[PDB]
Design a protein around this ligand. Sequence first.
Ligand SMILES: Cc1cc2nc3c(=O)[nH]c(=O)nc-3n(C[C@H](O)[C@H](O)[C@H](O)COP(=O)(O)OP(=O)(O)OC[C@H]3O[C@@H](n4cnc5c(N)ncnc54)[C@H](O)[C@@H]3O)c2cc1C
Ligand SMILES: Cc1cc2nc3c(=O)[nH]c(=O)nc-3n(C[C@H](O)[C@H](O)[C@H](O)COP(=O)(O)OP(=O)(O)OC[C@H]3O[C@@H](n4cnc5c(N)ncnc54)[C@H](O)[C@@H]3O)c2cc1C
Ligand SMILES: Cc1cc2nc3c(=O)[nH]c(=O)nc-3n(C[C@H](O)[C@H](O)[C@H](O)COP(=O)(O)OP(=O)(O)OC[C@H]3O[C@@H](n4cnc5c(N)ncnc54)[C@H](O)[C@@H]3O)c2cc1C
Ligand SMILES: Cc1cc2nc3c(=O)[nH]c(=O)nc-3n(C[C@H](O)[C@H](O)[C@H](O)COP(=O)(O)OP(=O)(O)OC[C@H]3O[C@@H](n4cnc5c(N)ncnc54)[C@H](O)[C@@H]3O)c2cc1C
Ligand SMILES: COc1ccc(CC2=C(O)C(=O)c3ccccc3C2=O)cc1
Ligand SMILES: COc1ccc(CC2=C(O)C(=O)c3ccccc3C2=O)cc1
Ligand SMILES: COc1ccc(CC2=C(O)C(=O)c3ccccc3C2=O)cc1
Ligand SMILES: COc1ccc(CC2=C(O)C(=O)c3ccccc3C2=O)cc1
Lengths: 207, 191, 188, 203
Amino acid sequence: ASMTGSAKLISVTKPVVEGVNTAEELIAYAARVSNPENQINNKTASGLLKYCIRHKHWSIFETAFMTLELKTSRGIAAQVLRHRSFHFQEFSQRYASVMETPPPHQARPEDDQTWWATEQEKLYAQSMELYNKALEKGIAKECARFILPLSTPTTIYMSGTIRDWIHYIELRTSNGTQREHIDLANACKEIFIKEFPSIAKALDWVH
Amino acid sequence: TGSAKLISVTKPVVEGVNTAEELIAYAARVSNPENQINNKTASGLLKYCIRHKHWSIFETAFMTLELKTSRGIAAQVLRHRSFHFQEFSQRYASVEDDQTWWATEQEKLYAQSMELYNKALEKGIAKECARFILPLSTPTTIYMSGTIRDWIHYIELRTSNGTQREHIDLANACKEIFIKEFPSIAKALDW
Amino acid sequence: TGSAKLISVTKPVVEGVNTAEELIAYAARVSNPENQINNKTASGLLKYCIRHKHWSIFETAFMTLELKTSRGIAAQVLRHRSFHFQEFSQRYASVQTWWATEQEKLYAQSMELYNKALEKGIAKECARFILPLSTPTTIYMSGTIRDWIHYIELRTSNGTQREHIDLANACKEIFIKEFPSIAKALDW
Amino acid sequence: TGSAKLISVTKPVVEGVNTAEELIAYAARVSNPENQINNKTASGLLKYCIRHKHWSIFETAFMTLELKTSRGIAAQVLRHRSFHFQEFSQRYASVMETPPPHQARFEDDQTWWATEQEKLYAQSMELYNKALEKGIAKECARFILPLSTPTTIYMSGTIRDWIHYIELRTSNGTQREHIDLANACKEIFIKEFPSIAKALDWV
Ligand SMILES: Cc1cc2nc3c(=O)[nH]c(=O)nc-3n(C[C@H](O)[C@H](O)[C@H](O)COP(=O)(O)OP(=O)(O)OC[C@H]3O[C@@H](n4cnc5c(N)ncnc54)[C@H](O)[C@@H]3O)c2cc1C
Ligand SMILES: Cc1cc2nc3c(=O)[nH]c(=O)nc-3n(C[C@H](O)[C@H](O)[C@H](O)COP(=O)(O)OP(=O)(O)OC[C@H]3O[C@@H](n4cnc5c(N)ncnc54)[C@H](O)[C@@H]3O)c2cc1C
Ligand SMILES: Cc1cc2nc3c(=O)[nH]c(=O)nc-3n(C[C@H](O)[C@H](O)[C@H](O)COP(=O)(O)OP(=O)(O)OC[C@H]3O[C@@H](n4cnc5c(N)ncnc54)[C@H](O)[C@@H]3O)c2cc1C
Ligand SMILES: Cc1cc2nc3c(=O)[nH]c(=O)nc-3n(C[C@H](O)[C@H](O)[C@H](O)COP(=O)(O)OP(=O)(O)OC[C@H]3O[C@@H](n4cnc5c(N)ncnc54)[C@H](O)[C@@H]3O)c2cc1C
Ligand SMILES: COc1ccc(CC2=C(O)C(=O)c3ccccc3C2=O)cc1
Ligand SMILES: COc1ccc(CC2=C(O)C(=O)c3ccccc3C2=O)cc1
Ligand SMILES: COc1ccc(CC2=C(O)C(=O)c3ccccc3C2=O)cc1
Ligand SMILES: COc1ccc(CC2=C(O)C(=O)c3ccccc3C2=O)cc1
């Protein structure tokens, strides 16, 4: 299997409160402090948080925030951007040029797929050739980028609260979503499981 | 060239108040009845509410505009996270002398990708997979939906100097619609 | 008892599209031309879009409602941050049997002190500080149809405070009148 | 009349990047590698980005603050819709702290107001306490509680959002108890973000 989606942790929330060391301990803390005269406080870390998700007490999961660096394609980025709750950071359209050569994209026919690879590579090299030819002649990076295909490799910072991350990963890992995006979301999920064990457990998410 | 068409706007049902703008003025008056600012003109009130950052009255009205642009300018557009967008389905929908050189070489490249794009479709390749070869300049049409507060700030940002020319043109075509539906706010902002 | 009144809704300007629900239905069909699901009822198509989390169509429409509630219920209401709200200026605008009895006795005394403070020329923003959570409040609640679906679904479900249930139910009725096909796709 | 206390702030993992502010300055530099502006100080780069509306690098950092205020002010604060909030349960929490008297604006008239506030406030407390004793639900018992009732809230938001909240709420005209609260936030903000404070001229 091809890996057409990568993610890396950039930052995550860190509590300054005594005894509470991680963002997930803060989500746990937020829940028990706000609702002290509740029997549900006595439950396990995962169990408490599961109850909150089940009951829609979302705000505790918004006391935490995580930035992940995503490596994907412009055509996929197009979908990612539509997740309005998140905040993003991308390369300057004027002070940054495309380094990586666009890779061939798989289709949804053994000699039909091979053709699609060869033909893409052909067109990509042609766009890349003309991209640098335009740069050499003085054309601004913002004008030159218009010839770059949708397969253009891209790195973006995707920043959002934990609640938002829960729903983005739930959606983008569900049956039917584009593969170059399920790869991305699963790459995100791996980082999430790590940082949030008790949430991963309450949502039933395995490595 | 980049263009915009009005698709929908807020229309109040409170008797006497007909347009979305009238409602914004109404909302600023009814919430502040003992305020001397209610005496002034429609534009006077709103210019005042804008200066003092009373944004909520501008949040009682919403507007959808259809933008005809390119994927590269839309790369910017989609970044104004306060707006709601509606684009076509990825799966169910199909598409001096150096300056002369840049155009000829663009058309040549663009004809090739479009050919291969069509070649891929006839072969049975899914549209979402076929899109991947299309340049950042593939023409796009999107619905941009947001509150009047949001539009004021998008237009103010995207029409300022430094903005990519092709986005300025888009923003200016949004400004013309905004000036038509909200003339008292255009007068208030000096547009 | 909490009530709601429709202030304003989205109205399309495009030919063949007259109501805000038609614009949603329009957007949901124009999205998928090659799609076969495009040949379902107005409500069937929308039921599919809700199911498949194709929310953006429900964000082409926007609605305002005037809520007649209390400050104690507004403390829940104001927490639905996807909504925009408009309230009377804090500066330029002025306001079982044992429980009901002792409550009136306190509330009436609260007004004597409130009215005296304004008679004395105290600023309204200051005179609000003596006011109880029970104090009535008329607010404007504006949000996209997506945000309205989720607020009503949450605030009508068992467990929420009755006073908030009444408020949300009063919002549900307006929604049902403006969006029958969405109300039907949601089984309301 | 209102205090703030830091609860949590974003913590980067990138090498050479140790703080939320350092990450903001980093996000701006990695983003535009072929730009001269990057060779200014952390404060300079950030002043440039603020002035030119490059807001997204300010949306890579997040802060949570516990605010100690009145229900009357909380009501204003809750309107800052880009922020996320965490409050005590309306059901499983009880108001211990007796509401204090608020200062009126337009000594003997001021005294009248404080005395009358203390009277009405205590009266509401005894009735609150008795309704609880009499088995009335904590959510139904809070309706007799006044707008002066002390409240502790978690206010969580991106650094961009905090810049504008501090600026608006410390600006001329703002209600006094709100300025004080906005100032107690300004104090924490400056400590965590000195080069942003420097670019905005906050000290
Ligand atoms: C000169 C420039 C350089 C940029 N460089 C980069 C880059 O290198 N990399 C990158 O990834 N991105 C870059 N961006 C994009 C940028 O940081 C934003 O992400 C983009 O401009 C979207 O803005 P926004 O979040 O303000 O969205 P909007 O949706 O327009 O604003 C969000 C909210 O903020 C409010 N708001 C905005 N201004 C005001 C105001 N004055 N008063 C009150 N409310 C206001 C709006 O009304 C709205 O509710 C750049 C933008 C510009 C203009
Ligand atoms: C199958 C599918 C088909 C699509 N087809 C089209 C098309 O043809 N054209 C088009 O323009 N777009 C399409 N889209 C994009 C879609 O309309 C959304 O706009 C995009 O998915 C962003 O989702 P969102 O706005 O919920 O984003 P997010 O930012 O992920 O979510 C917004 C907010 O909602 C909250 N939230 C989301 N889900 C939940 C939940 N279950 N419970 C509690 N809170 C929640 C989040 O926490 C967040 O604050 C499609 C999407 C899907 C999944
Ligand atoms: C039982 C209960 C107990 C609570 N206890 C506390 C407490 O002790 N302390 C406290 O501070 N707060 C509490 N809250 C409040 C809660 O944490 C939220 O702050 C509040 O209800 C507002 O929710 P929201 O952010 O989902 O707002 P909204 O404005 O309704 O949501 C923001 C966005 O999420 C999207 N969304 C939501 N649900 C869905 C969905 N199902 N599918 C797709 N999109 C969706 C919306 O459409 C909207 O765009 C409680 C809430 C409940 C229901
Ligand atoms: C003088 C005054 C009078 C008011 N009167 C009333 C009244 O009579 N009735 C009533 O109901 N409400 C009133 N309000 C409240 C008001 O209209 C807003 O609802 C409240 O101030 C919250 O602001 P916000 O939506 O900007 O929220 P925020 O969460 O602070 O802002 C939302 C977004 O806008 C962005 N933003 C804001 N300013 C800028 C900027 N300069 N540049 C870039 N981004 C920016 C933020 O960064 C954030 O992402 C008043 C407020 C003031 C200050
Ligand atoms: C003169 O042409 C220009 C001028 C400035 C920019 C600045 C800029 C934006 O405004 C923007 O939204 C953006 C969105 C996503 C990545 C980068 C940028 C980005 O770098 C892009 C083209
Ligand atoms: C087979 O792979 C697929 C499957 C579903 C889709 C559906 C879809 C999304 O999910 C999406 O976010 C999106 C975002 C913006 C425009 C269109 C779409 C869009 O059409 C796209 C490719
Ligand atoms: C039985 O009536 C109830 C039922 C549930 C609640 C739960 C709850 C909300 O729903 C809510 O928005 C809220 C908003 C701000 C603080 C606390 C709460 C909060 O605690 C409060 C009273
Ligand atoms: C000096 O006292 C003041 C001065 C001005 C205001 C203005 C103001 C806000 O700023 C605010 O969020 C607000 C929220 C809800 C209703 C009214 C207001 C409102 O009127 C409030 C108190």
